[PDB]
Amino acid sequence: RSNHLSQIGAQLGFVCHLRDRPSEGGVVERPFKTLNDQLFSTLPGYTGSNVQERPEDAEKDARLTLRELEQLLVRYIVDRYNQSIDARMGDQTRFERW
């Protein structure tokens, strides 16, 4: 909702639209669930989905730096997620529907 982004809206020509309730966001809410499950849960510093599920070893053996976590996340997107099938088309990857 910032001024700065609205300045970008004017300068690049997109219109900012607000989400009504969180569910309408699901196209971006859900990929956090997808990416948590398929990536972060496998990495040493995993922290669980909630305080009530927080695994106590997370701060005992956190071992990545962000110059590695970037590479992990970028590889996951570009070599897998881009080529993954779009869940309700089936005909083509996520990349080819773009």
Place this chain on the structure above:
DNA sequence: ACGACAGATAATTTGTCACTGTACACTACGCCTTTTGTGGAGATGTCTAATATCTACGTTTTAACAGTGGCCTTATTAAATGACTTCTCAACCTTCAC
């Protein structure tokens, strides 16, 4: 009889795929307590050499004067002066002169 040949047959697991329950909805390493060894003043206590003071130690110097020691010749006679001492301090009578 039982059980013993090769093969039937009711399981057992392997693999498909329509279905659904769920998280994504950002929202723990952070709030609070206690101990604790290290550290900064800052009042207070510690305790000396030393440069005197502060008389005395007594020790020199003076002059005053006291005592020792040397020298100093001694006689006679005269004079002047001053003194001392001693002695003395009669009295009636006779005779011849105017």
